[model samples]
Target: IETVPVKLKPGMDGPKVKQWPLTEEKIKALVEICTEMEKEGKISKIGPENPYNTPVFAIKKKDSTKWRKLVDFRELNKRTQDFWEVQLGIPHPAGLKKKKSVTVLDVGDAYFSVPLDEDFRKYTAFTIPSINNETPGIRYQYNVLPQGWKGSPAIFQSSMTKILEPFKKQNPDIVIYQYMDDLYVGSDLEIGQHRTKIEELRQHLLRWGLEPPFLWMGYELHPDKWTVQPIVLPEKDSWTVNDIQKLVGKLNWASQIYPGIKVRQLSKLLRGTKALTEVIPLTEEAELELAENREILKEPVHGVYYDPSKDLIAEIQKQGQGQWTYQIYQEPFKNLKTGKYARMRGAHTNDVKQLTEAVQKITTESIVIWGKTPKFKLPIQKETWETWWTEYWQATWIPEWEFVNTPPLVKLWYQ
Candidate 1:
């Protein structure tokens, strides 16, 4: 809503990935597609040939023999945040238990819907190997929004939020959540209401020239051939610095969706003070060689044991006695796998600070302590419970709290 044009920092050079050897089929297909995309005004050929020449490769589509063109944008991505970037939050609809229908829609080729500013278009340009042998190294660039540009999602999403604003305001009861390209519509109303809302949403998008297709769902990323399969351990110092950097980049992305990949160890390899193409020591070659990640990507990670169905914390709060509710407190303490807490230094003070911060944000009936070590007592001797909670309150701002020490509560308060 703030900015109309897509912004990219000027005078920024993009990453240069080594081109893969192209077969006759590959070269012809590349030129053909590039030409088609250009005709649709999705691309253009007006810029320095190598200003931001990122590499491109073909990825096999799911349940089919077709391949999709993929662009390598790790280098470009790192530079984008330094310039103008949009910070948008994804909607969370977890509290909607009574929603009857869930309708999902997608913005087809979402980035393509966003028009690129002419000034920033050249930064997205990349060189493609010439299909004809005589031409040798002819390349072209994109004048429209690119799929792999780091700013693409932010630009598209911001525009999308504005586009969907009218509908959001009119139908306050309909719960709508958007994650990048995917848009979800949910409500507790009857099926006709759901259908009507969906139709209205799709019609609005269509009028704006955005075809919200039901078949086009959310996007799923896939690893390349070398990334998914077991990479053989090359000879000591056989790999170039570029090889390690590229591999680490892929592994970093893979770790987000698939665990068990040696993302940390491989990340260390990048810390070496060597050029991208310079050869470095193969310290973790043994482990890297056997790292298989294809099958792992297909499976979901293990779930946490905490089930919200019981609502035990909510149950105790209504008794007006001693029950505490919890929200994900990211700082001071983090909830780990197996439902254990990672405590920080200065336990009593830290607890007060954490709880104080939480109460200001959300109303909590009780501050439930997890342990009895140090006990709930003010540092000031003979402090009354009313005095303790009142002391916690400040002028013009105070959060009510019923401090409880059942499982693990401590009331060691201090100035």
Candidate 2:
């Protein structure tokens, strides 16, 4: 494995941070975790002469039974130079729906698997406050890539992609999708063939000195469907801006599999918040939205299979006054399992032009249907709609004469 060197901006000096006060018990726990990390060669004891001195703290692990050490690297990250321009790629859930079988693999201790160059280790130096008054605080530096560093994801992503490039070329039949350390390997073949391909790739990863990738527990994958595991919610009634952001992020990810997530009410809580630590009281509407989101997540929802041979339909309608919404779905417009239409994308806007633009952007290769009566005039002028159809959508769309009536599925979704 190549050691990644930390590149700082020109004229950048290492940051010096004072350790935050912790109770004796908490300090003892941090020391114990740090000792284990040191034994594993993830961190090394450093002398006081090290230029960087970042604070180190411990947070309870997801299970709440163990402590995970974290370093405050915000200051150091500000001084670090950009490593790569390439953004990490995450395969869209829709693209994976066509696969016969799908499974996820996760790298154990993902970031820590990468070694940091000896010369750059000092820049990651952190201090652990002393448990008792007699002993001075001990200093340590990361030998491996540490968590909370800004450049770690991009650096690790680039390295992992390079490592798998050869395997990808050799096994053209298997589809490999990577998002940082999480990998999803899929195949359109039978179960046995898919499993064999996974094992082959696992061996290749092992040969490259990567930790043996293990099946990720976060997703339940099957031949026909995939669903995310239930997530743990915050225990408090009120939330800080940071907490809300984290919740919204998780819901946004879930929205990929489950359609029609109403974010109108929740968005009000996120406005005009500068500091993540600023606590906000929940309004009734926001509370209702959160409750509804949780209920939606609790219910079982499976991935929608995308069949390219099927006709794609973009359905648009005016909601209240000037508000307009559009939904894109397949011809059948209903999923037998969920008893509702599986929407690929749904958007709403008050401006007619914005709604049209959104529809044009989303339905690049879809046939759009206004789905209104012939007597009901659309908010957009006939000439404007015609111009758009002729200039941009003419290639994919059917002629205006073939416009059809609204399907029953539209009523189900809007109701």
Candidate 3:
């Protein structure tokens, strides 16, 4: 990622644009995201007066009712700092003979996570007009970074590179590739090394204050086992010409990642994609061809196989926030013998049979895992786990507590 310094002309202000009235749903959505940022001290509601001002508008997210609030930063962008452009280049796929496991991680609110200089914050002040004839709202100013700012991409990429530099230096053999905030970590190494590297990366991000609020999912992407899965375009007329083009555009990118002639042919249905006024009907011939192409592309791409739903540890961690706050996630270790990844949650600690089944289900070989104990964050540390372990006999799920009283495995995972 490259950033060019933005040199704004002197004494220039953005074109004054009035805020438009928003629907009840749109207003609610805007305030929700704004309020979340405010709670996090990322932004603040400012006074009414400011020399620099821009308009905020809500755009519909694809297939969702949520609206993404975007500011018209074009004028302000031209007035200050720098600009950034994002480029995504697809890599060639490998044969199944030497397949490697890949992990995909995305940075949440990528731009918003970067803080802006105080000098630039004033330039970002924008007003949210009153909804339904109410008093005009305060001119909200960004304390952190705002999207659509010039030079933001370069700044963010630079910061991220620095954060990952340490890990890159330590593990030279592991292949880590990044396209903006989306990262792909892969290695030719066995399951344990790869999983451990992923876990290290996760913790490092958390330690450095870069981890997103939700680290959603961790899955293995195997390109060698590509299978084309055709998806038939619904024979519905309500689909906008733009919508079809949008879908085609996505397939266009996928066609590169997983090359197949069928994907290329499907792009033909988007013949007049440039014409926004045109609402071309979905032709039967085009629809049939698209279905055929989907079958063809299945050969080039593989999916994220590790479903987060079945990961009891992750579920417990997310749920623990509310009900099980004292729960600790000891490292989910892979037995060296089996060479497969597994997590030993509270669910498995008591049921030796169930624990054995889980271990067998994860892998057959013997394994040992190790990790640090949290210090500052209560309920996340060793002492908290010890406390939770002591009180578990008092909880509702006592059957899972059978081995905790007799065996020493609990001590290894907890503290």
Candidate 4:
């Protein structure tokens, strides 16, 4: 056996996001939770000790030997990466509503790790009297999660990291993406040997350097396994609310749903594609609105997309709007409804218009493609956004390199 399965119950086990910028009363209650152990003595590992140090701690009885921890209300955010136009990042609402076989391996306990060497087992928590005296830049904030101290997640991930280190060479049949001790293995692997593959991978990680909880784990092999509904991020729907806004200049308001949302990389890549022609025929109303987005993909507006009083006409007079051209490329769309459609010049937004309109064009299709040289102002200032995704999280808990050789495979075990 590579790792003894642990007691960690996997289900969206992060912070319970209340309102952003928590109330003062909530903050006070949170602070009280953190210093509770300071008033009392450190009876054991899971005492009134706040695990995350948001001034919060575990409220445990002296006689009780067990405890559970929760995330502190810090950045009350539903953490997510860039929208997956294809198959990466948090699934969209429609994606999560269906039975999402989110494969996650539960390590039974934090202590189950075998350790990298003899000295690994001999670790200690409070190696210092006051973390404040530690250093300036190095984050040693006295909290459940010590700031700047990198060992927290590593401690969890490494525990499991050791359990799977041995199987790095075998090309295991599952994909794992781990964040500290909370290991999530993707259910993308075949069902029959899924459990066995998990156990075997756990065994290998132990051999290499981790001590993962092997026994007490659960799998959302099917939709029936999850106790509660999971709230995941929305997928990129360039054709929905975002599409129209992108067409006109009203995209900043929905930034939460679309992080690092930029049209530069998109329009830059779609240079001179046939897809542009498809959008060109949309109704003058729709075309005008879409043109704004098309223009953004091609070039930055002289001013912001938001200011109500600041008109695009004033800016045009200053800059002299010419044949605002853009290099058009096809941006791939991943949708069951439209399947995969190409968005041409997905980066630029042009400022053309009919009377009382920002842009104007009409075709036989009756596609309404226009927005009034928007009277409504932008809600926020513009910022730089990255055009592509570098990395993302998944359902699996294995480290990046741990399961490189072992791409998850499926085999059936029968009686």
TM per candidate: 0.42, 0.41, 0.39, 0.28
**Candidate 4's residue-wise lDDT over 234-310, tens digit each?**
22323443333343233332222234334443333233544432332234444443345434434332222323233
The residue pairs found clashing in candidate 1 are: 242-276, 369-408, 369-409, 370-408, 371-408, 376-411, 377-411
Q: Rate the local accuracy (lDDT) of all candidates.
A: 0.46, 0.57, 0.48, 0.28
Model 1: residues with Cα > 4 Å off, grouped in runs: 1-12, 21-29, 47-49, 58-69, 82-105, 108-110, 130-138, 170-180, 184-200, 210-415
Clashing pairs in 3: 6-81, 6-82, 82-150, 82-151, 83-151, 227-298, 228-298, 228-299, 335-367
On residues 1-415, what C-alpha lDDT tens digit does candidate 2 reach at each position? 5876667889988878777666676688788988888998989998867867886666542223455555667678768886645543333444454466766565435677888877778888887787555687878888887766655656687767787888889877665654333466767877777777777767666777633323323222453442222434455676998887777766665576567566667667988946989898888998888888778767655645545445544455544444444444453333211211123222233243444444543332121111111111234555556444322221111212223344433332232
The alpha-carbon lDDT assigned to residue 210 of candidate 3 equals 35
Off by over 4 Å in 4: 1-67, 71-102, 111-150, 155-160, 199-215, 219-415
All models, RMSD in angstroms: 25.8, 21.6, 22.4, 21.3
Which one wins by TM-score: 2 or 3? 2
Off by over 4 Å in 2: 1-5, 22-26, 59-66, 85-114, 132-134, 153-159, 165-415
Q: What's the best-to-worst order under TM-score?
A: 1, 2, 3, 4
Q: Using alpha carbons, what is the TM-score of model 2?
A: 0.41
Candidate 4 local accuracy as lDDT? 0.28
Candidate 3 RMSD to the correct structure: 22.4
